[PDB]
């Protein structure tokens, strides 16, 4: 039925402000380590950061966890990938079981959007195949993490670093490197051509079809093959069915709630292409990918 | 010296089974009580057919053997996993390691234990290159093959064989079913991502030359280039945005000290060097440790 977020408990009592030389944004602090984006420091390209790195002053980190009230302070800092893992004198006693998992493309997890080292808004995101989220970030919010929670464990995602004009957001995982080719770099980046995460848009349709309307007018009659539809797929801007073989249990089992194979779903979404004329579709004008199969069965 | 290292087969020799269905033979690799093999053993079949085709297999047609050590196993349950079988056995494998099934990104290196007859038969190194694919070494019957890397007493597996493609790249799953790639396991022609170099593993095996063949030879580019400079040729030449990994950037700072060459030099280097060939085989980790 719904878009379902992580709560983010876990997350806020984590959440630190880190503030050098003016330039202010979050960080997290798991154990006795607080990570944050590099550029804290500094803007600098290429191979600059090594040495910035270095001479930086311990005591230039203004680092303080205001939902605990304690100020923080560095004893030593290490650059790991375009990350800062800033050492500090005190555990943090609310850290949690935590994992860094890396995404996939097509996976989806909750920002824990904060500012001043403190979550303001929540929402859900998508990793796209250009490897960019479609967030929404301000000044200030760098170091805001993406998480998904498994039982006890916090799974980390994903830290924040850039927006490129478009508003699409960028940034590493916990490991310090990137998604896609993108750097922390103020400059213009090429970016990869947008592609649907099929996958997904297959569960939106099937969502609607599960709880808005069990026969929309724009529901194709007729089935098109698997195959037939990655070769259609191939010049559409449709990443090849199943983009991911996991998700054929979950949208197997969806087709038969709906009682619509996937061979309608898919040809559906090629009529879509040349005369959706505005038709809302699970509460979207649009084809999106923030539906993943798995969101969608289990729920 | 600076060498390719490999991970020791022994722990994945002793789980490699044989698993024949209806006159198909596969590999498969028994971790304990579940044997994980390709979906395809039990026959050639496409899209969305395969949940059905799956459910209609008797487990009594699986034959699965470990030949070292001497076991016939008897499957009990079928689980089509992603693009892969689970086959539930009633015995657990006793030399079953402490095992993670863990993704791979591209530019990574692993170790295939290319086996047949659920045999280990050879041992070689591959890279995952962006387009996906690795560039390996496989006849009728090696799919199950697993590639994987080792830390410690732990088991990373990272792939199981499945497809050979025309130009001789290989495709295939992660060990939770889900190939690398576009790449699916059907008998037709299927387009690849257009390559392009790994530029961190270049700038490692041209480091790797400098520091065990010739320490400047005559190639190397006189002048630097910056990266900012590089990374806008780089997207008209086939050449991923340098670093490609963070990470890597310490090994690779490391290896500019010790060679006394600066990385943009290095880069200059392969950008007048073009003129599988100018391999991404050997990773910045390899050759810096
Ligand atoms: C970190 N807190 C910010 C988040 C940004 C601010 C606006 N919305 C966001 O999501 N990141 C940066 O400020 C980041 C820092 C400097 C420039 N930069 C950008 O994201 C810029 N975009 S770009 C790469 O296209 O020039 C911009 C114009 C500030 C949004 C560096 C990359 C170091
Ligand atoms: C599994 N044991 C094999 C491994 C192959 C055999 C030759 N070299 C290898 O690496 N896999 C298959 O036989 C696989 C099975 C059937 C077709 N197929 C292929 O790899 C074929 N290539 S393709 C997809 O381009 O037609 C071929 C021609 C046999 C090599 C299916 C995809 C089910």
Redesign the interface.
């Not at 490991?175 to 990137?178: P, S």
């Not at 983009?243 to 996991?246: G, I, S």
């Given at each position: 039925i719904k878009i379902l977020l992580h709560p983010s408990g876990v997350v806020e009592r984590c959440m630190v402000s880190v503030v050098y030389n003016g330039s202010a944004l979050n960080g997290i602090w798991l154990k006795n380590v607080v990570y944050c984006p590099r550029h804290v420091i500094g803007k600098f390209?290429?191979?600059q950061?090594?040495h910035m790195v270095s001479i930086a002053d311990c005591r230039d980190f203004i680092v303080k966890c205001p939902i605990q009230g304690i100020q923080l302070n560095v004893q030593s800092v290490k650059m790991?990938?375009?990350l800062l893992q800033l050492t500090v004198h005190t555990n943090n006693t609310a850290t949690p079981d935590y994992k860094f998992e890396?995404l996939?493309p097509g996976s989806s997890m909750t920002i824990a959007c904060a500012y001043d080292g403190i979550v303001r808004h929540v929402y859900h995101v998508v990793l796209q195949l250009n490897n960019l989220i479609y967030a929404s970030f301000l000044n200030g919010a760098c170091g805001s993490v993406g998480y998904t929670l498994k039982g006890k464990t916090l799974y980390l995602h994903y830290m924040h670093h850039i927006e490129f004009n478009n508003k699409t957001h960028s940034g590493?995982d916990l490991?310090?490197?990137?998604y896609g080719?993108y750097?922390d770099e103020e400059?213009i980046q090429?970016q990869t051509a947008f592609q649907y995460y099929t996958d997904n848009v297959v569960a939106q349709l099937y969502a609607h079809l599960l709880t808005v309307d069990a026969r929309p007018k724009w529901l194709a009659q007729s089935q098109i093959?698997?195959?037939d539809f990655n070769s259609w797929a191939?010049n559409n801007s449709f990443?090849?069915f199943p983009?991911?073989?996991?998700n054929?249990?979950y949208i197997?089992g969806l087709s038969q709630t709906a009682r619509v194979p996937?061979e309608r779903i898919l040809n559906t979404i090629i009529q879509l292409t040349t005369n959706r004329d505005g038709a809302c579709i699970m509460g979207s004008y649009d084809f999106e990918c923030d539906w993943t199969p798995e969101m969608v069965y289990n729920q």
């Open positions: 390209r290429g191979d950061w090594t790991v990938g375009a890396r996939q590493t490991e310090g490197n990137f080719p750097v400059v090429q093959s698997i195959e191939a990443a090849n983009c991911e073989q996991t054929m249990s197997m996937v």
